[PDB]
Each structure stands twice: as structure tokens, then as C-alpha cells.
């Protein structure tokens, strides 16, 4: 056994001082690892000492514990929230000091920006002090800009962990209650409901953490910079502020009907993959039925009902984006209005300390207190089912009981045991016979101690074992699942594998024992399951053994085999309950035990009830390298817009940028302006020139509405642009899949396309246009945010390629292994729900050898490595954006720099505008970069929709020879040196066919089932191209499609398929027939007095894949369809496989008096089915050597057909010899 750590591994967060921590600055040797390679499992790093599993949940453990004592000695209910305050309150309330900080920091920072801007309005080029504050101002503002992106990401990364230790420790204590769950527990709550808890609830405890401190650090920031304007500019600020409030309910209605419109088309979304989902599954029937049109029909209208709603949400969805991003603008004119209004004047310093204080508000109100609501509310809601969880009711040689009365449900007043007693001595085998829903089970559960006795003892001597029904195997090597925990002994182990069959199982795996082979048995079936099992019981060598039905999924020579050598020869020492319902293995038991719905009447020996007359016969995934090409990119655009559509776009969104831009810009301007008319009117002037208002305010308020309206104009020309490309694309891709052969149906299953039509359609739908809108829209303003910066200063042109460079190569060097990572954390993930489930279906026989702690260390050890592929990914994400954040600031101190340098030739308004843009760089890059990062992951569901519009389909289904309205007249066949591939190219079965059919004459074709019988039935069918040439009314077949093919065929499948929708559109999807038709073809196959007891005999909505029918109803519905297309082609393939003899017989005799008028194909599946027929074709390995009649063939006696005839039973073979000899002679000589 591997320990968890090796030699010591390099972890330098241990080991690491300030600077290294602060930084990242230990993150180099992983990155550099995983940028020349492939980072594998082996290559994580351990988590810390505090941050391992068992200790986190040990202390919640306790701290739960006390809390629920605390809550007993109060009389009051214990809560889970109070327990998580008293054991993360002291990691947390130290976690607020930074928190007010950066707070501090960010309110602090418009105060020295506003301070640069003035030092600039009253600027003198002969004063050195002015000069030196306002450098010193500079640099205090760059020291603040540098804390905020170092310690606001350091904080967010310490805050990540903390929530990994709490979700962490939140399942282990989950998984520790699972392991006491009793049986009513169990009983009233499934493995799903807690697979689905450990998949979402838990997972938001990660994202509630990070805006946890938002609910007073929010509204503190909002009052401290509410004062600060106030003190600013005065009362004007209160307009804005009323503005950003009534923002709120706003925001609340539009996420309100958002969600009730996302429900509306999530139903028709439901509905229709639902229909997909049927059509995929009977793909090959809707082909032979060539009921394609309808279906695309009904389909499509589907789409187009689902798309209205997904425009209409599109189109809100726009309109909120819109609002979001022209809230800012909005506001600041507002407040600005109101402020030159009131008779005050214009200045730049002011001016742009509001721009920058209202962004940064509306910023906090609108992205971080509705988001940090939102993970509340969710986080109490997982704490309160966690809670209710944990609430459950918990668990509390020879074996003899004495009047046992146990009650598995309470609420019954019937018992599932009494009256129960049994004894077993070292030597004598006591077997348990009888029906199903006795209570063996129950007794044997009893035995263990799950069952509580209501009356009676128990009394077991020894150690306690167990096997369940259904085989528990978890994870590691099978060696270790054998071994359960004790040491590897050798002749143990060879008389395991020589006894219970497990040789044959050592060599067919790959490595023996040592394979590694991961939970829900994908490797092994359920007889080496259950054999793999046994052995792991036996393992033990326990004093009892209870084995409930492990010899079940075994063939009877085999299970007798593994019986003789291990159960009467081994464990004959021991203690053994064993519970069979065979009769042949309870010889060598001298004591067999009989019960009557749990109940004794008489116990003794084999022998002795032998004596009493007992009978027991009564009682009996390609995914794309890196970046996607250009190719999805150009695909994605032109297949629902056109090139003046995208031109147009491109315009309407580069308009939008440039009046956000142009409305700071004239703001600028007047500040300018007013700036120099004061400077005139006071400095020495006699004439009085004020500001035209009127014109000026105009000009503002046409800026804003301009880029209000652009901004909704590009937003929902983006939105519905983008629908209408998903829209083509999937339209497209559903034209494909209707003319695709059925060979690319044999190959991707139908989960693949069902995964391909709701994954990628509900992404490109909802999520992928959003993410595209706001990562276009970050874009647009950091160019503008570069633009204004370069427009202000040339200079910072020349160190920004350079920047720009590193960027671009950072963010390549950073995703390189940020890829691995997300695809080792996606990997790591789903082993801690397997284990879960693994354990939750094993909970008997875990709790039977009271060894739930090594299951708990298991789980602990996945959780473990969970963390630390979590915690790579929070590294590998932090260490990004410091990364960015420093190069943003690294940009600002340089405009901060250049603006103060070149003094002389920059007005106060300049320096502010670029002051004031570079400082909303912070964010706002890292927000385009994930965006990006989020859109290039999204663009993979592009390919794969394309990837099936342009799949190699099949013939078209209508050519230019169109058939004459009686073609085909009688369709004689005639088979001339015929093949079969699955596929041009491939493999060869069938070789060397020929025959001869008459006109309308029934013949019957037979062939084995494995070994000519699946190509027989690939050839008749046609569902390949086969390479041949078959002719069909002395033409060739292969000229048309399979709309002229199959139509003439009445399918026989295991599992007669039937759509869901009326019973008209069932048996005439195209209303080609009228209703008097309808209900002859119905009454003539004996369906409508079945029919007529439906409200809605005719028009009925019949359930999924026929639930209210059985499949002699969906047969005979196959055959009123048949009847009803009156046709001359009848195909029938494993009728008997699963039918009621007794409805085999009627669809037998119809078939046999109405379809007694055209040319009938029966494939011989039995040999009851061809007795009516006159040829007989004897395919045998896709050869036809024997052709010829039946009594001609059957004179032979080395022709296969009489020995198949022999093999099912010599009175059978006689009886279909004379019914043959029969049918001859009424064909032959009346």
C-alpha cells in the first residue's frame, strides 16, 4: 500500500515567508512542470496539516455534538448555524479586518485622485511644493492601488480555502451520519437525494464565504461615500443615489420574469428533447414507417415554440445588460443635472471623484448585494436540509431465538416475524427455502442487529458477516477489496481462487488482483461479483456467515461447482444461516428451514420432511487542442447573419464605445471650459461671459440617451443574432440526422446525441450568447479605456506593446496548466460521489463487520484529494490574477506618472478623465479575461453541433424516376452473388446468396440466431448499404431510398416501441385515412373494446413508450397499423421472446386469416412459423445451401434443418413432422 505522501513532497506554502505568500510567488516549479507536459494526479501537492479531512470533521463533529447537548439541556431544536458560528468564528472575524481595509482603501482612493485633478486646476509651473504633494499624493495613490490588487486577492484566496475546509468538513460529517443511518432512515430516504445534497448543497458553502462579509461591508462603503459627496458636492448627490435604490426593485421584477420565462421555455426545452430522445430511440422504425415528414414537422414546431420564449428572454436579458452598464451614466447625468440646476459650478476634480464614487457604488450594489443575498439564502437553505439530515433516527457458539416479533414498519399492524426459532451447531448447514416477500431477509437482518427486535432476544455468539444481494465492491484493487483491511496470506488466497471460482476471473483480468478497478463494477458482471464477494466474506474467517443469494447470478454447473468446493468443505466448522429457494443445494444441509410469511410451524431434516410430503415445486470525446480554429468562429456568425448583418453590428457596437467614451469626453470638455470662463471673468475681466446651460445640458442629455439607446440596440441585435445562428445550427444539424444512415446511429449511442441536444443546444441558447454580450462588452471598454488613455497621453503607447505582450504570454503560459488542472479537478470530483453511493448501497454489510472506520478513512483519503485538486485550481487562479492586478497596476502608476511629468502640456480635465479611466481597469481586466476564458470553453459545444451538420448522409429520399402509382406490383426477389458490410470496408459474413421467389408467394426464410440469423435479418432488412445486387420485380433495389424500401414493413422487435401522442397520429401520422377506416382496422385486429374504455377513444394522449398497454397490445397495434397501410410485405422476428403464449396464439391465427392475400416473408424464429410457408431458405453462416421445399430438405439427414428440428424435444420434432406432412398434403393433395 502507497502511503498518501512519499518522501517529502513539495509543498513550499509551508515553508514559504511574507513575500512568497503575499505574492505566489511558490507556484513557479508547477507551472513549470505542467507547461513542457502533462500534469498527472501524482503531481499534486498535499494540503496542509489543518486542512485535512478526518480533523476538520472530527471538530464539526464535536462542536455539532455540543451544540445538540446545549439544545437538549434548553429543551429548544437544535441548529446547525449556530454550531458553524462557535467552531469558524475565530478563522472569521480576524477575516474582517481586511475586509474593512480594502474597503477603507477603495473608498480612499477617489479622495487622493480628486486631490491629483486639483492640484492641476490651480497649477503654477514656478511652484515646487505644489509640485512635491501632488507627487507625494501620486505615490500614495499608487501604494493604496498596489494594496487593493495584492491583499483583496489574498484575502479571496484565504477566504476559498475556509470554504473548502467547511464544505470539506460538511461531508465528512454527512458521510459519518450516513454510516448510522437506521433502517427507517434508510427507508424514508433514498441514496439520490444525498448524492444530489453532496453535489449542490454542499458546493455552495465555497461561493456564500466569498460575499459573506458584503452584508455590512456593503452598506458601510455606501454611507462613507454617501458622506463623502455630501461633503463634495453637496446636496446633489441624493438624486443618484434615489436613482441607484430604485434600481433595485427594478433589477428584481426583471429577474422575476427572467426566471418565470426561463421555466416557460424549459418546459418546451423538456418536451422537446423528450421527443428526441424517442425519435433517437426508434430512429430505425421511423426510417422503415417513413414517417420522417411528420416528425420533422412536429419537431420543428416544437422548436419554434421553445425559440419564441428564448428570444423573448434573449431580448430581457439584453435589455438588463443595457440597463447595467448605462446605470453609471445614467446616474452621474442625473446627479449632475441636478447640480448645475441648483446655480453651482463645474469642476473637474469634483466631477470625476463622483464619476468614480457613483461607478464604484453602483458596482457594489448591483454585482456584490444581490449576488451575496443570493449565497446566503442558498447557504441557509443547505444548512437546514444538512441540518434535517442529521436529524434522522440512528442505530442502536450457537444462535437461537425465542418468540421474535419484529415490526420493520411501525405504522403496520401486521407482523413481518413471529413465533421464530432456529438452531444451528457446528457441523450442520441450516438452509432457509420459501417464496418471495417471507421475511429471510428480514430474519437475517435481524440476525445482524438491523432489525430492532419490538419482542423477544437475540442472542449471536462470534464475529458478525454478512453477503448482500447485490454484490459491494469499493474502491481500490481488488486485491484490497478482498482482503477488507487484514494481511495478504497465501494458501487462503489459493483456496479462494481455487474454491469459489476466482482462478478464471485471475486470468482473464489484466493484472490478477492487482488491477485497479474504481466503484460501480464496470469491469465485472454480476456473477464475478457476487463470486469476488464471497470471497471478501470468506476472507474473514468470521464465526457466522449470512449469505443472502450469492449463487444466483451464477449458471447451475458452475454455482454447484463453487458450492462442493468451498461452502461444504470450508466452512462446515463454522456458522453458517444459509438462505436458498433451490431445492438441489440442500442435500448436504441436514437442516432445512420453511416459513410461512415469517412464521415457524415444524423445523428438522431433509430426510424428516421427505417424510411429511413437502413439495417445493408448489411453493416455487475528441475535445479540441487548446483554442478552437477560426473555423467555429466563422460558422457560428454566418449561419445566422449575413456579412452586412455583422458589418452593421460591428458599426452599431464600435457607435455605442465611442459615445460612452465622447460622454466623460464632453463632460471633460465643460469642466474645461468652465475652468477657463472663470479664470477670464475673474482674473482681471470686465465683461460677464457665463455658460450657455441650455445648450450644453442639451448636448449632455442627447449624449446619454444616444448611448443608452446604442447600448440596447447592440445588446439585442447580439442577442437575437446569436439565437437565430443556434437556431440554424440546430436546425441544420436535425436535417443531418434525419438523412443519416442508420450506421452512424450503431456507432454513437443514443446518449451521445441526447447529450449533444441538450447540453450544447440549452448552452448556446442561454448561457453562451450572455457570456459572448458581456465579454464583448469588457472589451469594448477596456479598448476605450486604452484609447482614452492614449488620447490623453501619446507617450504610453510606446511601454504598453511590451505590456500587452507579457499579457498575452502569461495568459498562455497560465492556461496551459490551468486546462490540466480543471481536467484533474473534473476527474478527482466524481470518485467521492461513487465512493458515497458505494457505501450508501452497501450500508449492511459495512456495518455488519463494524469496519465503518476504514470506510471513513477511504472517503476521507477521496475528500483529501478532492481538496487538493481544489486547492491547485484556487492557486493556479490566484496566482493569474495577481499576476493581472499587477500589470494593471504597473499600467496605472505609468499613466499616474506620464500625467504628472508632462504637467505643462495637460489641462486639469485631461489628467482627471485619464486618472479616472485607469483606475476602473482593476476588475474590469481580469473580468474580460474570464469572460474570454469562459467563452473559448463554451465554443467546444459549437464544434461538436457542427461536427453533425455535415455528416455523409444517404440517399435522397425522392428522385426524378418517380414509381408509377402500382409499383410495386407483386416484388418477386432474386438473389445474385449478394455480400453484407456494416460498412464499405469492413467485415464479411455474408457470401453467395441466390433464390427464386414467385409471385405473391408466401415463403418463410430460417437461420440461427448468432450465426445467420443477424445477417439474415441485416440483409432482408437493408439497413447498411449492402454490396450486391439484389432485384426486386425484376429491378434493381438499390435505385431509391428507404422511403420506397422499408414502408412495406410491420417491425417485430424485442420491445414493440410506440409514440407518444393520439392514437390517430399513431397509426396515420399524415391523416391520410378517415375515421370509419381507423375504427375497422381496430376492430378487425380485436383493439377497440380495449380502446373504448378511454374517454377519448379516438384522440387520447397515450403515455410514454406505452405504459397503460403491454407488448401483446403494442403488437397488435404494429399489426392494426399493418393492416391498416394495406400492404403485401409481412416480416415477423422473435414474436415468442417475451409474449403471452396465450396472445401469440391470436396474432398467430390473424395473420394467418387476413394475411392471406399478398406475399408474405416470414423470418423463422421458431419453427412453429413457417409451417404455412412454401420455400424454406436455410442461411447458415450467410451461405445459402439448402434452398429448396421443407419435406425435400428434410429427406436429408445430415441437413441442419431436421437436426434443429430434433434438439427441441423428440415429441416436439414429431409433432411438427406430422403438422408438416399435414400442411403438405392440404397444399398438395386436397
Known amino acids: 500500500m502507497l502511503p498518501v505522501y512519499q518522501e517529502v513532497k513539495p509543498n513550499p506554502l509551508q515553508d514559504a515567508n511574507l513575500c512568497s505568500r503575499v505574492f505566489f510567488w511558490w507556484l513557479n516549479p508547477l507551472f513549470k512542470i505542467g507547461h513542457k507536459r502533462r500534469l498527472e ?87 515646487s511644493v505644489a509640485l512635491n504633494t501632488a507627487y507625494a499624493y501620486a505615490t500614495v495613490l499608487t501604494f493604496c492601488t498596489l494594496i487593493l490588487a495584492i491583499l483583496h486577492h489574498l484575502y479571496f484566496y484565504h477566504v476559498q480555502c475556509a470554504g473548502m475546509r467547511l464544505r470539506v468538513a460538511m461531508c465528512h460529517m454527512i458521510y459519518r451520519k450516513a454510516l448510522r443511518l437506521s433502517n427507517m432512515a434508510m427507508g424514508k430516504t433514498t441514496t439520490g437525494q444525498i448524492v444530489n445534497l453532496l453535489s449542490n448543497d454542499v458546493n455552495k458553502f465555497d461561493q456564500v464565504t466569498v460575499f459573506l462579509h458584503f452584508l455590512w461591508a456593503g452598506p458601510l462603503q455606501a454611507i462613507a461615500v454617501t458622506a463623502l459627496l455630501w461633503m463634495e458636492i453637496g446636496i446633489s448627490c441624493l438624486a443618484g443615489m434615489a436613482v441607484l435604490i430604485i434600481l433595485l426593485p427594478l433589477q428584481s421584477c426583471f429577474g422575476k420574469l427572467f426566471s418565470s420565462l426561463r421555466s416557460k421555455t424549459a418546459t418546451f426545452t423538456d418536451a422537446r428533447i423528450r421527443t428526441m430522445n424517442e425519435v433517437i430511440t426508434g430512429i430505425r422504425i421511423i426510417k422503415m414507417y417513413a414517417w420522417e415528414k411528420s416528425f420533422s414537422n412536429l419537431i420543428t414546431n416544437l422548436r419554434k415554440k421553445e425559440i419564441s420564449k428564448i428570444l423573448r428572454s434573449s431580448c430581457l436579458r439584453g435589455m438588463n445588460l443595457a440597463s447595467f452598464f448605462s446605470a453609471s451614466k445614467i446616474i452621474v447625468f442625473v446627479t449632475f443635472t441636478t447640480y448645475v440646476l441648483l446655480g453651482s459650478v463645474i469642476t473637474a476634480s469634483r466631477v470625476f471623484v463622483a464619476v468614480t464614487l457613483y461607478g464604484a457604488v453602483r458596482l457594489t450594489v448591483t454585482l456584490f448585494f444581490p449576488s451575496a443575498i443570493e449565497r446566503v439564502s442558498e447557504a441557509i437553505v443547505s444548512i437546514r436540509r444538512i441540518q434535517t439530515f442529521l436529524l434522522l433516527d440512528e442505530i442502536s457458539k450457537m444462535v437461537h431465538v425465542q418468540d421474535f416479533t419484529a415490526f420493520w ?139 443472502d443469494d450469492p449463487l444466483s447470478a451464477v449458471d447451475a454447473e458452475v454455482s454447484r461447482h463453487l458450492f462442493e468446493l468451498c461452502i461444504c468443505q470450508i466452512l462446515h466448522e463454522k456458522i453458517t444461516i444459509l438462505v436458498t429457494h433451490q431445492l438441489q443445494y440442500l442435500k448436504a444441509a441436514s437442516q432445512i428451514l420453511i416459513l410461512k410469511d415469517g412464521k415457524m410451524v415444524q423445523k428438522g431434516t431433509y430426510t424428516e420432511f421427505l417424510k411429511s410430503g413437502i413439495d417445493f415445486g408448489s411453493l416455487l470525446e475528441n475535445r479540441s487542442e487548446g483554442k478552437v480554429g477560426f473555423q467555429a468562429y466563422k460558422n457560428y456568425f454566418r449561419a445566422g447573419a449575413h456579412w452586412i448583418v455583422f458589418i452593421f453590428l460591428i458599426l452599431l457596437n464600435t ?17 474645461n471650459k468652465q475652468s477657463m470662463l472663470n479664470v477670464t471673468v475673474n482674473g482681471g475681466g470686465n465683461v460677464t461671459e457665463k455658460l450657455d446651460l441650455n445648450w450644453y445640458l442639451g448636448i449632455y442629455s442627447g449624449l446619454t440617451v444616444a448611448t443608452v439607446l446604442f447600448g440596447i440596440a447592440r445588446s439585442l441585435l447580439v442577442f437575437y443574432v446569436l439565437v437565430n445562428s443556434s437556431q440554424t445550427l440546430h436546425n441544420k444539424m436535425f436535417e443531418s440526422i434525419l438523412k443519416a444512415p442508420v450506421l452512424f446511429f450503431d456507432r454513437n449511442p443514443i446518449g451521445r446525441i441526447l447529450n449533444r441536444f441538450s447540453k450544447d443546444i440549452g448552452h448556446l441558447d442561454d448561457l453562451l450568447p450572455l457570456t459572448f454580450l458581456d465579454f464583448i462588452q469588457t472589451l469594448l471598454q477596456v479598448v476605450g479605456v486604452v484609447s482614452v488613455a492614449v488620447a490623453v497621453i501619446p507617450w504610453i503607447a510606446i511601454p504598453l506593446v511590451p505590456l500587452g505582450i507579457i499579457f498575452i504570454f502569461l495568459r498562455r503560459y497560465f492556461l496551459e496548466t490551468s486546462r490540466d488542472v480543471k481536467r484533474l479537478e473534473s476527474t478527482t470530483r466524481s470518485p467521492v460521489f461513487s465512493h458515497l453511493s458505494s457505501s450508501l448501497q452497501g450500508l449492511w454489510t459495512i456495518r455488519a463487520y463494524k469496519a465503518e472506520e476504514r470506510c471513513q478513512e477511504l472517503f476521507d483519503a477521496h475528500q483529501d484529494l478532492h481538496s487538493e485538486a481544489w486547492f491547485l485550481f484556487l492557486t493556479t487562479s490566484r496566482w493569474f490574477a495577481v499576476r493581472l492586478d499587477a500589470i494593471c497596476a504597473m499600467f496605472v502608476i505609468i499613466v499616474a506618472f506620464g500625467s504628472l511629468i508632462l504637467a505643462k502640456t495637460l489641462d486639469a480635465g485631461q489628467v482627471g478623465l485619464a486618472l479616472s479611466y485607469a483606475l476602473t481597469l482593476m476588475g474590469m481586466f481580469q473580468w474580460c479575461v474570464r469572460q474570454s476564458a469562459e467563452v473559448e470553453n463554451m465554443m467546444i459545444s459549437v464544434e461538436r453541433v457542427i461536427e453533425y451538420t455535415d455528416l455523409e448522409k444517404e440517399a435522397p429520399w425522392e428522385y426524378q424516376k418517380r414509381p408509377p402509382p402500382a409499383w410495386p406490383h407483386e416484388g418477386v426477389i432474386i438473389f445474385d452473388n449478394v455480400n453484407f458490410m456494416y460498412s464499405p470496408g469492413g467485415p464479411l459474413v455474408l457470401k453467395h446468396l441466390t433464390a427464386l421467389i414467385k409471385s405473391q408467394e408466401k415463403v418463410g426464410i430460417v437461420g440461427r440466431t448468432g450465426a445467420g440469423k443477424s445477417s439474415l435479418i441485416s440483409a432482408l432488412f437493408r439497413l447498411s448499404e449492402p454490396e450486391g445486387k439484389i432485384w426486386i420485380d425484376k429491378i434493381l433495389t438499390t435505385e431509391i431510398g428507404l422511403h420506397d424500401l422499408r414502408k412495406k414493413m410491420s417491425i417485430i422487435p424485442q420491445e414493440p416501441v410506440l409514440f407518444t401522442g393520439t392514437m390517430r ?131 436429408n439427414k445430415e441437413s441442419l434443418f431436421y437436426k434443429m428440428v430434433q434438439q427441441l424435444g423428440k415429441a416436439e420434432a414429431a409433432a411438427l413432422t406430422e403438422t408438416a406432412k399435414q400442411v403438405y398434403f392440404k397444399r398438395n393433395y386436397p
Open 41 to 127: 494526479e501524482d503531481d499534486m501537492y498535499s494540503v496542509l496539516p489543518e486542512d485535512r479531512s478526518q480533523h476538520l470533521g472530527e471538530e464539526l463533529q464535536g462542536f455539532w455534538d455540543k451544540e445538540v447537548l446545549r439544545a437538549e439541556n434548553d429543551a429548544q431544536k437544535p441548529s446547525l448555524t449556530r454550531a458553524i458560528i462557535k467552531c469558524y468564528w475565530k478563522s472569521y472575524l480576524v477575516l474582517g479586518i481586511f475586509t474593512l481595509i480594502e474597503e477603507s482603501a477603495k473608498v480612499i482612493q477617489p479622495i487622493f485622485l480628486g486631490k491629483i485633478i486639483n492640484y492641476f486646476e490651480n497649477y503654477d509651473p514656478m511652484d
Open 409 to 547: 414498519d411501525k405504522a403496520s399492524e401486521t407482523p413481518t416475524l413471529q413465533g421464530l426459532s432456529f438452531t444451528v451447531r457446528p457441523g450442520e448447514l441450516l438452509a432457509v427455502v420459501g417464496p418471495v416477500g417471507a421475511g429471510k431477509s428480514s430474519l437475517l437482518s435481524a440476525v445482524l442487529g438491523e432489525l430492532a427486535p419490538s419482542h423477544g432476544l437475540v442472542s449471536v455468539h462470534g464475529r458478525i458477516a454478512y453477503v448482500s444481494q447485490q454484490p459491494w465492491v469499493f474502491s481500490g484493487t481488488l486485491r484490497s477489496n478482498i482482503l477488507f483491511g487484514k494481511k495478504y496470506e497465501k494458501e487462503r488466497y489459493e483456496k479462494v481462487i481455487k474454491a469459489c471460482a476466482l482462478k478464471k476471473d485471475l486470468q482473464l483480468l489484466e493484472d490478477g488482483d492487482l488491477t485497479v478497478i474504481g466503484d460501480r463494477g464496470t469491469t465485472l458482471s454480476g456473477g464475478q461479483k457476487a463470486r469476488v464477494n464471497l470471497a471478501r466474506a470468506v476472507y474473514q474467517d468470521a464465526d457466522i456467515y449470512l449469505l
Open 655 to 671: 457607435a455605442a464605445q465611442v459615445a460612452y467614451v465622447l460622454q466623460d469626453w464632453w463632460l471633460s470638455y465643460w469642466a
Open 1065 to 1195: 397520429k399513431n397509426l396515420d401520422p399524415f391523416n391520410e385515412h378517415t375515421d370509419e377506416e381507423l375504427w375497422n382496422a381496430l376492430q378487425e385486429v380485436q383493439l377497440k373494446e380495449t380502446i373504448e374504455d378511454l374517454p377519448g377513444k379516438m384522440d387520447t394522449e397515450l403515455a410514454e413508450s406505452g405504459s397503460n398497454f403491454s407488448v401483446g397490445q403494442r403488437q397488435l397495434v404494429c399489426l392494426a397499423r399493418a393492416i391498416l397501410r394495406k400492404n403485401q410485405i409481412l416480416i415477423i422476428d422473435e414474436a415468442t421472446a417475451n409474449v403471452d403464449p396465450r396472445t401469440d396464439e391470436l396474432i398467430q391465427k390473424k395473420i394467418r386469416e387476413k394475411f392471406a392475400h399478398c406475399t408474405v416473408l416470414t423470418i423463422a424464429h421458431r419453427l412453429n412459423t413457417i409451417i404455412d410457408s412454401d420455400k424454406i431458405m436455410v442461411l447458415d453462416s450467410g451461405r445459402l445451401k439448402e434452398y429448396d421445399e421443407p419435406y425435400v430438405l428434410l429427406q
